[PDB]
Design an enzyme around this catalytic site. Structure first.
Site, short mmCIF file in Angstrom:
data_model
loop_
_atom_site.label_atom_id
_atom_site.label_comp_id
_atom_site.label_asym_id
_atom_site.label_seq_id
_atom_site.Cartn_x
_atom_site.Cartn_y
_atom_site.Cartn_z
N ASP A 1 -12.86 0.63 -5.96
CA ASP A 1 -11.82 1.48 -6.52
C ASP A 1 -11.27 2.39 -5.43
O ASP A 1 -11.86 3.43 -5.13
CB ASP A 1 -12.42 2.33 -7.64
CG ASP A 1 -11.40 3.24 -8.29
OD1 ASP A 1 -10.19 3.08 -8.05
OD2 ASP A 1 -11.82 4.11 -9.10
N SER B 1 6.99 4.48 -1.52
CA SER B 1 7.77 3.26 -1.52
C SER B 1 9.25 3.59 -1.33
O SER B 1 9.73 4.64 -1.76
CB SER B 1 7.57 2.51 -2.85
OG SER B 1 8.45 1.41 -2.98
#
EC number: 3.4.23.22
Length: 330
Positions: free
Chosen positions: A35, A199
């Site tokens: 994770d 992004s």
């Protein structure tokens, strides 16, 4: 040194991925959920409340000759999905894919929430976010990657998750045969303890690319892709009959639909998520309403590039003094 381990989907939907991890001496092999959005290595154990164990493999520290109780240390965690767990702490030898760390903090669960009990395939978590998020008290502990970093050939790990198939986590090296083209690296902020990046925009299907900054985290422990409501609305508008359902808890779509791809930007590069990757199947057995793999982050407080996005790429988690992330197509 290096390590390399195969990671395998737990079910036919890729809801999560499990990777075998050797703990203790002699080794006890547990299948952990790696994770990158958390920083605790915790396991089901001989100390876990018996009614809360249902098929998991357990770590028994009393059978490990290298286990040592970390005196006074406790841990307690709550995850973004509302699940939680808590317990005490041992140090022991932990190996992943041939890479060994001695003195790793292994957080032994005394209590786990129902969602963990109900998932017999996941024996614990191995956190790969920054050690500033580790919950051990009163002395915070380091992640497996943090402990291994100095010994690695290069201070990196890579995630190569498969679509409906196994993939690979590598530590200490870049496998240049595992991706196509080049790896585009992008800046990371560690201010919230996550692999947080920005992004450069998105496209829906064959549509034009929209240049817009989307700050979010690269999170292997989250199944879906969680993005701003404007972006998610633009995606599902291209699927006839798709709608946000308050009762189901997100966007659903007719199982008869063909889904468009979704592209996200990494600098000037583009990662394409095929439409198939966005289908999470019937909302309940036999239903013709299917659950979408792109969902709004409006209720989270952060955007999350979970497995739906990450499995479309070869992802480099560069733990150099100034960390960065790298993405390549594959």
């Amino acid at each position: 040194s290096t390590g390399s381990a195969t990671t395998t989907p737990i079910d036919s939907l890729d809801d999560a991925y499990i990777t075998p991890v050797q703990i203790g001496t002699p080794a006890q092999t547990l299948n952990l959920d790696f994770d990158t959005g958390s920083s605790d290595l915790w396991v089901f154990s001989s100390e876990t409340t018996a009614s809360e164990v249902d098929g998991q493999t357990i770590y028994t520290p009393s059978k490990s000759t290298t286990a040592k109780l970390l005196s006074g240390a406790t841990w307690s965690i709550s995850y973004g999905d509302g699940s939680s767990s808590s317990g005490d702490v041992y140090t022991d030898t932990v190996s992943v894919g041939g890479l060994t760390v001695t003195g790793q903090a292994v957080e032994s669960a005394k209590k786990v929430s129902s969602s963990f009990t109900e998932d017999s395939t996941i024996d614990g978590l191995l956190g790969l976010a920054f050690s500033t998020l580790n919950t051990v008290s009163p002395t915070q502990q380091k992640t497996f990657f943090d402990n291994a970093k100095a010994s690695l050939d290069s201070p990196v790990f890579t995630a190569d998750l498969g679509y409906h198939a196994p993939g690979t986590y590598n530590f200490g090296f870049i496998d240049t045969t595992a991706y196509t083209g080049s790896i585009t690296y992008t800046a990371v902020s560690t201010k919230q303890g996550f692999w947080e990046w920005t992004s450069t925009g998105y496209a829906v299907g064959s549509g034009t690319f929209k240049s817009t900054s989307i700050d979010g985290i690269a999170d292997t422990g989250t199944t879906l892709l969680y993005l701003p409501a404007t972006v998610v609305s633009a995606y599902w508008a291209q699927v006839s009959g798709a709608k946000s359902s308050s009762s189901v808890g997100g966007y659903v779509f007719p199982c008869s639909a063909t889904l468009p791809s979704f592209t996200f930007g990494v600098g000037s590069a583009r990662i394409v998520i095929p439409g198939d990757y966005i289908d999470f199947g019937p909302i309940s057995t036999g239903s013709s309403s299917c659950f979408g793999g792109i969902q709004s982050s409006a209720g989270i407080g952060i955007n999350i590039f979970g497995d739906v996005a990450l499995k479309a790429a070869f992802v480099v988690f560069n733990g150099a003094t100034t960390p960065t992330l790298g993405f390549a197509s594959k």
